[PDB]
Subunit: 375 residues, 2 copies
Amino acid sequence: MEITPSDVIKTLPRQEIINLGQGNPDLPTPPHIVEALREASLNPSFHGYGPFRGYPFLKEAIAAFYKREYGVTINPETEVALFGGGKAGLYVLTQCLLNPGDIALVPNPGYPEYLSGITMARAELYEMPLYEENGYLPDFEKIDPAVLEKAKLMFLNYPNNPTGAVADAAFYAKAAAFAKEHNIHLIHDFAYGAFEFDQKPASFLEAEDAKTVGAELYSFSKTFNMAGWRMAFAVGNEKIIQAVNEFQDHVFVGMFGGLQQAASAALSGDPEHTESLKRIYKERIDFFTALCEKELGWKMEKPKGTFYVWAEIPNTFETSHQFSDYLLEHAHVVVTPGEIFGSNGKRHVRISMVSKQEDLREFVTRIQKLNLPFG
Amino acid sequence: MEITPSDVIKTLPRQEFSLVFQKVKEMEKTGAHIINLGQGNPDLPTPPHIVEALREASLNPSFHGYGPFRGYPFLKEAIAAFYKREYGVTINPETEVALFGGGKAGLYVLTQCLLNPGDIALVPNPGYPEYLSGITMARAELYEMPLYEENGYLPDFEKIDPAVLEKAKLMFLNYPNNPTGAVADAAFYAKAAAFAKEHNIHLIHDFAYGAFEFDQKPASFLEAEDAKTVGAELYSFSKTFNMAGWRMAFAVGNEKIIQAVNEFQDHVFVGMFGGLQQAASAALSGDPEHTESLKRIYKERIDFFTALCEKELGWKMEKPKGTFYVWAEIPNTFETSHQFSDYLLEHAHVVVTPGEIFGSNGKRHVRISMVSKQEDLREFVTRIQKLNLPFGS
């Protein structure tokens, strides 16, 4: 009788043909990042253990990146921690900031792994609904004042998975001011922060009192098509980072020097690379949503951010799950049912613009042979 | 008011971390030159064929995107093949293999996937400090299994209070042993497996130094009857292949423990860079020559060092049966392991690891790693001699 712990058994199975499901970038990592890894790997200094907290040269790159892109001042020796990807960062941050029985404030809809780190910390979730009428921003006023004392952590995510909503500096000032009043650690998930199409994407850390209450998680995965490389960092409050450092001292010994060099080449590289990629996603979104309306009758929002389209399922379907499953079965295409993002996602699917045109057209046309009432 | 979790404020300070810091400060200001025989950090480089495997693999755009969450099949198959070749052990790679970003991460994950709050874990004393770290993060109770020299540092299972065995859900063992250099044989593993099954204890065998038994063929815990029934084995690339910095490891064992591991890591990981997995695959299927030759270097250093230490200091120390570690008694003039090691740092400028880091049975011992070439080991002795301490007893 092998016995898993309560943590394991209460965790859900992870839910992640034309695949417009997983948000897996299809374009390669830029060549200069690959060359940096290839070159660094020859350096025997990286074959052995290095600094537990990661190399200074990477932490210096991170601060310089945050100054260049967002005008934010980051002390690299104290306000930066490294993670093996944003998924691991979310987990570490949650374990460092939540005790069993504390309340975590989580958007609905929202990235499903927020709920999961909260579960391994044995904490209680309280939902902040995201409604289109509010621009998919939370109404902090509608949170039960009784939970606020017990609420220790809040998750926010803009540009937003799965809705593509964006937030401006005034929303972040309000969020931080709210978090301050109620002693809530605020984690901003900036995994799509390269991808706001109209305005320059604003960091949470531009807002007054942001660094006081919280931190920003930045992934390499989407910005630089480095999803496979498993690299991320957090920037923010010095106390948060010290806690992270203390946890990770027992769990890791930094990460391969070659990867860190590659990450340093990514951050200091020309921004024109990322803008080009942003242009590619933008053109695919125009292609896709125009062809959907014209050839199917499916009227879709164009997202303000990210490479995701959030579309309403036909009136004749029970749940996003069945609709999703109808498409995989009969049309042989993958979309992500909105339900995995929370109850507020029912009746929507998330569709990822991580395929080239040829696959996006064949998506639409395969679905035409189904003649659904998108009207 | 930033408020760390109770898990963090309840952790020990990582000692290798506090030392890295101490040393770095010393090297900077003023200009101390230090011989560091503390952390077991391999001084020799990763073999070139492993390095080139990574270099070629990184050009493969299939690895630039998300891969399979639980690892690439080609690696798990290479792991099964390796265990069959080195040890007699048949391993099902689709169900009995899990990948980790290093053995230290493995330990944390296995602890979290196997212990509930209040559960009891059986931990060797002396033992690797991270065993105790993960337990505490799991909010579990620690019970010690003394490792005594007279027993060859193998635990006496019969001596565990039978009242503990019900709440005991986990046991760590570790041979070739850190810090003692002790080794285990097939009979010992059979006895451990027998004992684990008879009391329903998940058994984790840490095989981080499994390449480094000098006088015999190293024996896998999985070679034992009942082994895959009650537990799993942790293997690291760190020491075998001078890949400490690459952060790669795996567990092989009971398919139920592995599924538990997989259910955790699906939510925290999605594997690691495919370039590193191919590099590991090439390490595993590579010629044992590299490893055999690496082993011989470590042994000649141990022979040199312990000889020299007797000759020049009157410091007599038992040669280890495995690992690159020497486990040595501290002078009687010294009160503790820490104040002895602090003294050698400050006065000689040499690092050794205080034994008390490994548990109460390591007070009065230090661990010294043979991770510098002979003439650096000679300078190490030379520096200590200049202190004239009474290494006689």
